[PDB]
Structures are given as structure tokens and as C-alpha cells.
Amino acid sequence: RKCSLTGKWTNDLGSNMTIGAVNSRGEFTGTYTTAVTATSNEIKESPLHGTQNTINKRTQPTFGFTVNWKFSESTTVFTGQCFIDRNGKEVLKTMWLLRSSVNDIGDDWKATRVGINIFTRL
Amino acid sequence: RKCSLTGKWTNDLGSNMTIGAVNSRGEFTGTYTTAVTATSNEIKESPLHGTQNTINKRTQPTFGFTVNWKFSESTTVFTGQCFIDRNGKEVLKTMWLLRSSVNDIGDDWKATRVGINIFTRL
Amino acid sequence: RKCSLTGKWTNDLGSNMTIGAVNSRGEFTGTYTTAVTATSNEIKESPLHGTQNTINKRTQPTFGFTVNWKFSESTTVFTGQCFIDRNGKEVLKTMWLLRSSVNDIGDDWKATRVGINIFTRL
Amino acid sequence: RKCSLTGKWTNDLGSNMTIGAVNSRGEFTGTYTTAVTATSNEIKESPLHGTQNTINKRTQPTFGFTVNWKFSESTTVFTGQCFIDRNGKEVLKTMWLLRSSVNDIGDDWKATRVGINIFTRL
Ligand SMILES: *[C@@H]1O[C@H](CO)[C@@H](O)[C@H](O)[C@H]1NC(C)=O
Ligand SMILES: *[C@@H]1O[C@H](CO)[C@@H](O)[C@H](O)[C@H]1NC(C)=O
Ligand SMILES: *[C@@H]1O[C@H](CO)[C@@H](O)[C@H](O)[C@H]1NC(C)=O
Ligand SMILES: *[C@@H]1O[C@H](CO)[C@@H](O)[C@H](O)[C@H]1NC(C)=O
């Protein structure tokens, strides 16, 4: 009854991710294949790097990771918690910030989008 | 000129961070010392890990990173862009999500805070 | 058809709200009965006031509203869009910010929570 | 003594707003002139409507309001708190969600931007 991040996951938009073994410092690496984009930039699998919080041997740890898109100048970060829901089943409930690139610091105000994603095992 | 992440930075709240070398894939690690908290827990320097976007090797790249707090069960993620400001200084304009740990999935809705930080070189 | 706000709605958290007539300027009022809290204080039905955007008279307009909670010192704002879903139901897709009250400007950083809600007709 | 929303205000981006008298239910109306946009539609002053919360005589109420843009199909909501600094100068520390109009519910994920604004009296 630990919710583990490692493994293969799919979210509510159709995107898939893989997360490998969580190491000695709570660190993990993975891959991210989004089902949605918004420019003639064609989707490609992109790496992610992140950590899970192991404070107090928490059975439902918090975590975060960054997606380093290999088809966009943008970055997304995701943060959430791994739950064991009503059916003994694992869910990652996350929110994200997607930072776009702007040309001038005066345009910074409009550069950051926000949303949610729920992941379940694939 | 190129706006680099590497080095020592202070933000508008008085927190410090140090980012190391950024490698060929954009990956970096570092340390974070927050000046603010809300726990009875003693603040402790905590590890950070992240990446900067290398698509088109932009002079003012986007990035993100995860701080894996070593005194709280929470996690923060920061996303941003490095700019050269009007005065020639490098500045990181960022936004963050701070994920708290909750016991039940039923409380997930209340678990995520949002805010900004501006970082300047120390 | 046009997706209209007027009427009785429920969200994924079980919360209820009722929106009155929308005037020619897009203004409406309503009431909101949250299913969730984190207070020792009992939930009470609370007023909301908002606007729907009328530019180009879109069939799936954007809108926002503020809920002035009767039993907490907090404020919540919601912004979204009313869509006709794939199955022909009206749905409101929203995000919100929940502003807590802090005693000192020094604690401002931690006072705003963010989340989503999806509303369907009751 | 009690921080008041009524008046003329300007923010960190150079936007101005006006807020009128607050009634006994904490409700107010106003106007908003943004200094920044991102289309060729001329910026036009736009109405706002909001409420402040003063449960149990808060000297620094939380509040929220909605800006009903008259030159965009979008909506912005702002929520924050009215702080009185110790020289008796007021500041509104706010965060906002800006909801863009999208054509298809499948694009809803990318519709909501987030940021901050600090307002002072003008
Ligand atoms: C993720 O995998 C599922 C099932 O294996 C597949 O049908 C779907 O196309 C994938 N989605 C992607 C790559 O976005
Ligand atoms: C950050 O480092 C500087 C020295 O470079 C020090 O004076 C300051 O107190 C440090 N702040 C924190 C919050 O650790
Ligand atoms: C919302 O309304 C329905 C009846 O239409 C009721 O069953 C439910 O208890 C209400 N929920 C709240 C939280 O008021
Ligand atoms: C707001 O007010 C000041 C003083 O009237 C003025 O200088 C500034 O141009 C105004 N900005 C906008 C966006 O209207």
C-alpha cells in the first residue's frame, strides 16, 4: 500500500508517460508523449526529470517533475500526489504550469498557462 | 548575450538558490534555501533539479525545476524564463505551484497554492 | 444553440450553484452551496456575482464570477467557458483562485490556492 | 483604518482601474484600462464587478472581481487582499486568471493564463 510513481501512465487528455526507478535521493527520470499540442510543431516524446517527497515514508507522496519539450521552446512543470483511491487503485492528481517563450520582458505577463491532469496506470 | 541559469540567485522573498552546470541536454541540479515557511519545522537547504529548454538555443531560454523539500512533505515546482533586464542584469521571472500533502483524495482540491518569484544574481 | 449560464448547476465536488437571469450587459447574480470546506465553521449558502462576455455574441461564451463566502474570510473567483459537450449537454469548464486572509503582508505569498471545477446541469 | 477598495489605482504593468463605493453587502463596480493586450483590437475601458469580504470586521478584506473585456472575447478574474502598510498607504496584492475563448472543448486545456498584479493608489 505505497502509491509508487514508477511505471506507465495515461492522463485525461490521452497523453502517456513513463517513469523509471526512484533512486536514493527521491529522483526519477521519464518520458512524456502528449496527445495535444497547438502549433505545426509535430509532437515527439520528450524527457522528464523529477523528484518525489519521501518525508515521513509517506504512503501517498507528493512529487513534481519538469517536461523538457523537444518540439517546443516552452517548458511544463507538473506537481501532485499519488493516491490509492476507493478501489485500491492508483491515481496521480496533478496541476501544471506551461511556460511559453516571449521575446521581451514586457510580455512576461502573458507567458504562463495553468491546468490540471489526472493520471492512471496504463 | 546568453542568459545562463548557472550560479547563485536571491528572490523577492529573500530565498537563495544555487544552480550548477547546465549539461548538453539542459539538465541541472542545485540547492534551495527558502527564507519563508509556515511549519513549526526548521527550514533546511533542499535539493533542486530541473532543465532548461534548448530548442533553438534561445538567448533567454525557458526552464523548470522541482524543489524536494527536506523539512516538509510538500513539493514546489518553478517554471520561468531567464531575461536580460532593461538595466543589463540577468533576471529569472518565474511562477510556482506548491503541492501540500493531504490524507484523502477527497481533499485534493485544497492542496495546491500558486505564486510568483523574481530572481536576481547574488 | 447558445450555452447559457442561467439555471441550476452541480460540480465534480458535489457543490451546487444557481445563476439568475443574465442582463443585456452580461451581468448575473447567484448563490453557491459548496460541498467542501476545511473550516470548523458550518458551510452556508453564499452569494455570487459575475459577468458573461458578450463580444461577438458567442454561443460558447467566457465568463467569471466572485463568491463572497458567508462563513469564511476567504474569497473565491471562477473563470471559464460554457460549451456544448460532445453529447450535446451544456457544461461549464472552470478554473478558480481561492484567496485566504493573512494577517501580515509578509505572508501574502502563501495565500492563494488554484484548482478546476466542471459544472453540469442539475 | 480599514483598507478600502474605493478609488483610482494603477498596477505594475501600467494598467489603471477605478472602483466605486462598496455597498453594505460588500459589492462594488468599477472600470479597468489595461496598458497591455495581444491583438490589433483597440483597448477600450471595460467594466468590472466584484465583492469584498469583511466577515468579523477585517481591516484588510479579501476580495475578487471580474473584468468584462469590451474588446476581447476573453474574461479575467482577480482575487486578493487589501493591505494597509504602516504609513497608511494601501496596496492590493492580486492574482488573476485570464480565460481565452476556444472553439472546441478539446482545446480547453490551453485556455487559462495566470499571473499577478500589485495595485497602488493613483
Ligand atoms: C498511449 O498509449 C495508448 C494505449 O497504448 C495508445 O492507444 C495511445 O495512442 C497512446 N497515446 C499517445 C502516444 O499519446
Ligand atoms: C543567502 O546567501 C547570502 C550570502 O551569499 C546570505 O547573506 C543570506 O543570509 C542567505 N539567505 C538565506 C535565506 O539563506
Ligand atoms: C445540491 O442539490 C441537490 C438536489 O437538487 C441535493 O441533492 C444536494 O444535496 C445539494 N448539495 C449541496 C451541497 O447543497
Ligand atoms: C493610467 O494613468 C496615468 C495617469 O493618468 C497615465 O499616465 C497612464 O497613461 C494611464 N495608463 C493607461 C493604460 O490608461
When CB atoms are compared, the residue of C55, C64, C72 closest to D73 is C55
Q: Chain B residue closest to C105 (CA)?
A: B13
Method: X-ray
* Residue of D16, D32, D117, D121 to test ligand 4 pocket, by largest number of atoms within 8 Å of CB: D16
Dist CA D33 CA D17 (whole Å):
6
Contacting residues for B62 by C-beta, under 8 A, at least 6 apart: A73, A74, A75, A99, A100, A101, B52, B53, B79, B80, B81
Tell whether ligand 2 has an atom less than 6 A from the beta carbon of residue B115.
no
**CATH code, residues A1-122:** 2.40.128.30
Q: Which residue of C has its CA nearest to B111?
A: C113
Residue D56, C-beta contacts closer than 8 angstroms, at least 6 positions apart:
C73
Q: How far is A108 from C30, CA to CA, in rounded Å?
A: 35
Measured CB to CB, residues of chain D less than 8 Å from chain A are 13, 36, 38, 97-98, 106-107, 109-110, 112-115
Which subunits count as partners of chain B given 3+ CB pairs below 8 Å? A, C, D
Q: Which three cell numbers stand for residue D45?
A: 475601458
Pairing of strands B46-52, C112-121: unpaired
Measured CA distances, A36 to A15, A42, A43, A93, C2 (Å): 7, 10, 8, 19, 27
Cell of C97: 483562485
In 3-state terms chain C splits into helix, strand, coil percentages (rounded to 5) of: 5, 50, 45
For the CA of D35, the nearest atom of ligand 4:
13
Task: Identify the bridge partners of residue B11 per DSSP, sorted by sequence position.
Answer: B119
- Asked if residue A99 lies in contact with residue B64, where contact means CB atoms within 8 angstroms, the answer is yes
Q: Is C25 annotated as a binding residue?
A: no
The dihedrals phi and psi of A52, each to the nearest 5 degrees, come to -115, 145
Chain D residue with CA closest to C89: the answer is D105
